[PDB]
Structure 1
Amino acid sequence: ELPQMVQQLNSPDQQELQSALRKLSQIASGGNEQIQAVIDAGALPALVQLLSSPNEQILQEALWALSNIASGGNEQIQAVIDAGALPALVQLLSSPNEQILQEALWALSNIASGGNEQIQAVIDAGALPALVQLLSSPNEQILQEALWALSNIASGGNEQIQAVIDAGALPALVQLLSSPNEQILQEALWALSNIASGGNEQIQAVIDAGALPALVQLLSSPNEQILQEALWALSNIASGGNEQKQAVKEAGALEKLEQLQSHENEKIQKEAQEALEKLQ
């Protein structure tokens, strides 16, 4: 069944290629055991070749198939990496095709949905410069995918968090907290809080970027999720040293946090107290 499809991916017949591609994608969309069967049949080197196709139909299916493969476990993400997917996927971030870019961004975010070793592979391939450029996009849909992918990069270890910092993502994220669009705020703050999960060097890079004045302002937000996410970043930068703890105190958070203690939503009531006790 599968060896016969993997073989057809080399076929000069575009109907044969597309039919097997459409079959492999639907078979890989399924279970994690199914993803392995597709891997083992050698579909991966064949799929990576197709990422270079000028044919949008065969490229769209190939991308779907790879993002569905990278939907699996940590060492199946590694197979996608070892096959050499990343450079082709990073190449596609310069695409004017909104659908191709959406698929390529999805696949990269799914590859970044694994362990630090996998997350580093994405960084190593050079995804971050392209990702940061996309935060300056006027497309709210492109912005979301780029912010999703970045948040997944910034989920990893300190080496991966500092990578995002060194990629100059923070000024862009800070500039995005001044957005009137509450849905952009949700995604920018989410990525920013992941940067804020790091060590003292990383906590300080966030502080130096002018993040605190925007976060302290957002603590008086009428959106329960944006207010919750501001707390997220603060309680995360509170984890850092007394030198950092002080910068937070002189941001004016102290009173806003003292007020938040008495909230209608008991979820942010504890999220504020945990931030307070880790500050003094």
Structure 2
Amino acid sequence: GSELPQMVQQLNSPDQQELQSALRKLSQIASGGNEQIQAVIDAGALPALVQLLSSPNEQILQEALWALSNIASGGNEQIQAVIDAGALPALVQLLSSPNEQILQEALWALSNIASGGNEQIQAVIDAGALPALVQLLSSPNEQILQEALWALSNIASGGNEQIQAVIDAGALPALVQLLSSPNEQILQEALWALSNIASGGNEQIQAVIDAGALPALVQLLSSPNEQILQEALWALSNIASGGNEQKQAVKEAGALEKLEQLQSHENEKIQKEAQEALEKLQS
């Protein structure tokens, strides 16, 4: 028939050269936009790409993971098609891989799927991604740690059930430790993930407090780095949006003195955020 379903037919071919050629083309189409992603889906590529995730052939695996992560970068309905095809069990299994290239690509697809709706984020949790993601926060490999933080932040940006699943997987003590990191990129991502957990209910905001995040957050307000300051202010302001018990905990941590000083900062974005955080605590 048409050119795209023919490429899909070559994905199960005994000729590995014919397989790689068709796989390379479908991957290139899937990286060209939502309309091009749908053409790949309609040709029936997803069941065939999912089958290739089990391949012991790293050359096939790298192109198949590249294609799926790109299909997962489209709309919510396109992300759902990736889940419906049964990609999540294969993606979760690849998190225990000693191959850093396969691992990073599995982390790309999982974070992209976890960037969809609440029910889609829940499907990533139900597949069992959280234990491996929490474990990867202890990795000495800065690239893997960042990809794992990105995937965790996307899961933590979900609703009550999703944030609760992140807390229950023991992600908070690891995230609080990462606040004392010499790496500005890692610090930003740990602050992004903490802000998302603190964007939940009063009990979930309290879990961030019980984890010991406030002393580290209050100290980050004395940073000469305006970018770190904005990230730290975003996290504290989310905690400030909690109940009176949570508001009092921020006051005891010594935030009011620092927030009063930050109202006089040269940077306008820092001024607005610190004034807003102080408004939440004093009222």
Normalising to structure 1: TM-score of the pair? 0.99
**Percent of aligned pairs sharing the same letter:** 100
Shift of 1:3: 1.0
Tell me the equivalent position of 2:233: 231
Unaligned runs of 5+ in 1: none
Tell me the equivalent position of 1:84: 86
Distance 2:105 2:163 in 1: 24
Shift of 1:226: 1.0
Can you list the C-alpha shifts for 1:118-162, whole angstroms capped at 9, x where unaligned? 111101101010000000000111111001111111111111111
Secondary structure of the structure 1 residue equivalent to 2:12: coil
Can you list the C-alpha shifts for 1:189-216, whole angstroms capped at 9, x where unaligned? 1111111111111101101000001000
Distance 1:225 1:244 in 2: 25
Shift of 1:41: 1.0
Shift of 1:184: 1.7
**Residue-pair matches, total:** 280
Instruction: Say if 2:1 is the partner of 1:8.
Output: no
Distance 1:40 1:182 in 2: 42
Pick from 171, 195, 216 the counterpart of residue 173 of structure 2.
171
Secondary structure of the structure 2 residue equivalent to 1:126: coil
Can you list the C-alpha shifts for 1:198-257, whole angstroms capped at 9, x where unaligned? 111110110100000100010111111111111111100111100110011000001001
Shift of 1:73: 0.2
Instruction: Say if 2:121 is the partner of 1:119.
Output: yes
Shift of 1:75: 1.1
Secondary structure of the structure 1 residue equivalent to 2:242: coil
Shift of 1:46: 0.3
Distance 1:179 1:19 in 2: 44
Distance 1:8 1:201 in 2: 53
Tell me the equivalent position of 1:30: 32
Distance 1:151 1:164 in 2: 9
Distance 2:92 2:154 in 1: 16
Which piece of structure 1 moves more, 60-69 or 111-120? Answer: 111-120
Can you list the C-alpha shifts for 1:94-130, whole angstroms capped at 9, x where unaligned? 0110000010000101101111111111011010100
Distance 2:189 2:223 in 1: 15
Distance 2:182 2:41 in 1: 45
Shift of 1:183: 2.1
Shift of 1:165: 0.7
Tell me the equivalent position of 1:278: 280
Distance 2:240 2:121 in 1: 25
Provide the alpha-carbon RMSD of the alignment: 0.7
Shift of 1:279: 1.0
Pick from 46, 49, 65 the counterpart of residue 47 of structure 1.
49
Shift of 1:182: 2.1
Can you list the C-alpha shifts for 1:21-59, whole angstroms capped at 9, x where unaligned? 001000111120111111111100000000000000000
Shift of 1:185: 1.0
Which piece of structure 1 moves more, 210-219 or 154-163? Answer: 154-163
Normalising to structure 2: TM-score of the pair? 0.98
Tell me the equivalent position of 1:188: 190
